[model samples]
Target: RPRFSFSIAAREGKARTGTIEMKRGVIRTPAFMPVGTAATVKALKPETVRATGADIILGNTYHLMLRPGAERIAKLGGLHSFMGWDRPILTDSGGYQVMSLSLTKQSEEGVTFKSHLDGSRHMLSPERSIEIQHLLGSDIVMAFDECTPYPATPSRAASSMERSMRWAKRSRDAFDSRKEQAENAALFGIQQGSVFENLRQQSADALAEIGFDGYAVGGLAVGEGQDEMFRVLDFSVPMLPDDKPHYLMGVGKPDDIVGAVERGIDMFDCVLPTRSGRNGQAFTWDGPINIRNARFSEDLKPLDSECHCAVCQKWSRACIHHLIRAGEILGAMLMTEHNIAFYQQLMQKIRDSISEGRFSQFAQDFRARYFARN
Candidate 1:
């Protein structure tokens, strides 16, 4: 097991190709981490997820703590063995859930909320959130910070950013106080400010001052359109530490990811692929398609002519389309696997393009066809 670390293997313009060394395994950047909320990526098995070329997966602290219980997982074994994915795992601090979910109360001390699952009451603070992640034995633990709401006024954004900074300081303190936890895992500070540039700078500078293993750009992809999100990234990404990994939290479609990488984000995680797959959506080189649509009733082409996944290689659109239309679970499973594979393959191509100094053209080429029919 290697000590946790990151290094840029290559850079093309603002795009970076890098490696994140951890005890479990090495993660390549710009990387796309599969979202495994509640210790599972919905329908896929851990071995199946690993086979899709994913180097890491994202876990939701909010869901895990409420269900199975974090302490229970720690007692049984760490997340790696419990989840059966012996690779890097990054766990969110549950700040987003406390802010957005129903029946939540907030204060300077922490957030108290009823579990969405069973309506059980629970409290999560900087210290407790860090403690839970430590107990889960996550490889990369995120700092507890508010996911500032979109469309906030400048004053509101400022106040929220200030509180998050204070929370970040507390999170760092909690993380550092545990020497055993600190030895094996890495902590990442998240930048929050909604859409305010000055507030973003303040948050970034404050986090840099406190220091951490990585940094995440939070508060985007909430409702801000792609243009607005990119505008925020343009100014915010440059302010973060260039030497460390810059993760874009809960970021989005294939194009959204390509755009972020163009702006220098090295890591990403989102539920779009798997979640949409379960609903009959399939992402292809020519854009997204609904498998249950009428037009696909007799279509005989593969999901993507260019995709080489087992589903794509062995099955045609007509097969999954019928499965989805007939309400078969296999349709969702197959679509999920293909969608996940597409993302991983996209990241691999991005890495290659960056290393070859052609990422600008690569992104342009991808968007052209991806949005052509739509």
Candidate 2:
């Protein structure tokens, strides 16, 4: 049996503060999983990520398998050894990419596409998804399926959601076959039903019946407005089994994260921080700041005046702004580091507030200050 288990420490309405104990480490909720898409979190190193208070992070099976190949990583000693990180790694099944990249040709078994790297042909199915994650030795692996993009008709969404449910069953069987061999690694099945509440409820019920170590609400945040995303969480989270961890995939801004947690989500991952950092955007406690703005060209304040994170504690906004204006690599590094710190710190604050049963007031005050605008 795996040494994995989760416990709720406190609750505020539907919100919860908890601990997820796994072999790699313990992830505290509401947790912000830093995105390490291609085996690395871009400019930040593994130690730097850990230093920022991130208990767990995500990897992309689609990207890693295309480059170094999962078999290669397994031979080198799994993702942990290959990446030189001894913490928990949750890898996505590449469902999002399948729709956006590999959808030109599709089969009932899987989707086929030319590799983005070298034009090599590839197929991604439920069983293959589990195979790739197992070879990578991921601590938490996502099931293979499609994300229903916005604007699809309800019937279209239903078709997509049902296909994903069938895929989930195959994924579960595959995960079970690997259990004895992988031992401690766990697989998370995804629920996909777009914006339709009835469909969402049915998908949730299907996943709960299939059973997984964790459950992720997928096919969201893909151009559905923030209001739409929150509505889905409000309606969908309660239907999922309360005993397992609930992950919201590819979501969202700092405020969006807080709202999702308040609605009962325990885990989240997104590319906003790293992607925005490289583009000279920084998220601070005081909303988000554009470092390239002329207003910050001479400002000497830290990113957030009261934040004790590495970026706010030491680096000045002017310094970061100058580096970005000059196109220095350090600018991206510092900004990325600070963004990670900000996200992790936000999760810590949420968890503490929930544990103390004061999350409602804490969230209200935070939103007021965070959205005050400069």
Candidate 3:
């Protein structure tokens, strides 16, 4: 089997439906990869996650490398075996988390930071990040790049984007150096321009020259709001290589996903569904509803009447509400399961609408119902 191949089956406007054929399995597009931050998708089991129609899950390089360590995982048969998920697993390069979680000092060489866990000093260069991903046996490896912060000045954005492009070359070289790992896994470069079209074009041009297996549009979902994010995507998505997958990193709510997919993003991973589920928020076709509200105390309906997941099929809103209010663990589990299933179902619907050439209508209807209030 080939290491990785993407084929588009249908298109409607900028939205398209297709599949990513990998050695482990086939991932349907537009795909929503559930974030498994610590080798687990929070309260849901691997089987439960699979049953939600997910063909791939995302792992965090920083978390795994800090806790159990990537070398340990490789010795124990890789992240797939360690986490009990057999499907494709994509791992981030740890740049974002390191920047967010630690006190970092960056330079031409790499980033040196004090670990948030124990304040231990460590360095993560493009080569080391690639090695860590290889050790974890990631199916899709993201190139190491600085996740440019929002509201950056023109000069700052340009400098950051240029630095990231240089690192992209280093990342490509490092991945190629590992001959066996390069043959088995695919590497994707990230584009960071912080909302500037000119910067975005330059970044994309640099990454294209480097030639990655895929491309990711980064640095938008960092408090830039929906309108600004969409504006960036409008110009940025077209700059990426259309044949490879266009991944939008750290992207967002259901509506956000719909809009991004409509703008030509093929892959996404976010912690919203899992994190919100733990906080008593349950996502549905209509919108997100808080189950801990007193109004749900007497409502005997399912979490989402339209959902057929095990949690929605067997549990009642009243019961889930009471459990969450009482701080029961099962409530979080059920909510996470339902939310994940709901996201997967949403992706399936998006793919179907695009394949049928009705994505515009589907998106219109979705927005109307999702934002409408009784």
Candidate 4:
């Protein structure tokens, strides 16, 4: 019933670099789980994905439920076997996809929407969502809730938060019945309130009343700027029990991750690395770069002098530039690898700072280095 037996191996200010031991495996805190929606981490294999310092991966119930279907996956030997990754996998509930597809719908029961792939009708409810994750054999399961879009009116946002609280209870009830909650899975409650402080406070309290194993600050980085996100987190993070792992859902860019970790976020997942890789954009400690840029056509330097990725070791800016220019598949693969590696490196740095108990100084130095004046 302890959500996670998380022992703080080290600490730096609000940052904690530690291990979260669940029934599944040990998850390193300030860690990044490379997202593999639809059971693949895009351009990388299982070993390749693991080599990037990732101990866990994220599975998308939204896409997998529509594609292979839960019943099909259960019969095929669960998601870990289906995906060929033997480590831990945390499955996100398809609630956000439902919210995205049916933003026009207004209901207390659930939302009705059309699938992005085939325009087929579908309805998402708490019971159905829980069932899918269980069938997928999810190690860490997400609670079902409506994600409030940013810039929503206070009246509308409050109404949505109330609905999310109701759904959170439903999600908890469903998880409570799961046999796997004892051995195979842990369920995390998502806090939803868009960006309103009072709404977030109310959401947090509601979730506390119906406790979950872990907690996530849902509905963030949905276009709410980092400044505002920080403001909300400043107040909202303390509302939850400090003992549970806190995950920030659907966040963020590189610096965004740094800021969120500083504000006490323990877990995160985003598509920027794999998503941007396909588009020829690469993230480095210096900042982001467009691999297609012609100026790098003959530059022989590594992507970043500070980087230690395999791609950075064997390839040059010029070679990457050429491959990206010619639309080579290797280009996407290599770039994805480097981007994921960079994220992993960032997470390690956070852990190191926390272990050393010098997060404030490290954070300040990081900001200065990244925001250096020309």
- The TM-scores of all predictions, comma-separated, are 0.97, 0.96, 0.98, 0.94
Q: Model 1, 208-233: lDDT tens per residue?
A: 99998999999898888999999999
Candidate 1 TM-score, true structure as reference: 0.97
State the TM-score for model 2: 0.96
lDDT of 4 by residue, 1-374 (tens): 33457777866656677888865578899879888654454448878878888889999888887786788999988988888877778998898877665333547787667777777776677877888899998888898887776789998888888988999999888887877653567889998887788898999989999988788998778887889888888888888777778899888688888888888889989999989987888887767888788878998997777888888999998998888888888888888888999899889888888888787887888887776621
Residue lDDT tens for model 3, 112-179: 88868778777798999999999999999999997777778988898989999999999999999998
On the 0 to 100 scale, the lDDT of residue 218 in model 1 is: 91
Residue 17's lDDT within candidate 1 is: 99
Candidate order by TM-score, decreasing, is 3, 1, 2, 4
Better of 3 and 4 by lDDT: 3
Deviation in angstroms for 342 in model 1?
0.5
Model 1 weakest 10-residue run by lDDT = 35-44
Q: Residue by residue across 1-374, what tens digits does model 2's lDDT show?
A: 23578899888899999999998889898888887643454457888888999898888888888878888989989888877778898999976876776444776688877887688887789989899888888888898987777878999899989999999999988888875534788778898888889999999999988988889998788887888888888989998899889999888699998889889999989989989989999888789999999988888999888776778888899989999989898899999888888898899899989988899998898889889976
Query: Top model by lDDT, which number?
Result: 3
* Alpha-carbon shift of residue 129 in model 2 (angstroms): 0.4
The candidate with the higher lDDT, 2 or 3, is 3
Greater-lDDT candidate between 2 and 4? 2
> Each model's RMSD to truth, in Å?
1.5, 1.7, 1.3, 2.1
Which pairs clash in the backbone of model 3? Answer: none
How do these models rank on lDDT, best leading?
3, 1, 2, 4
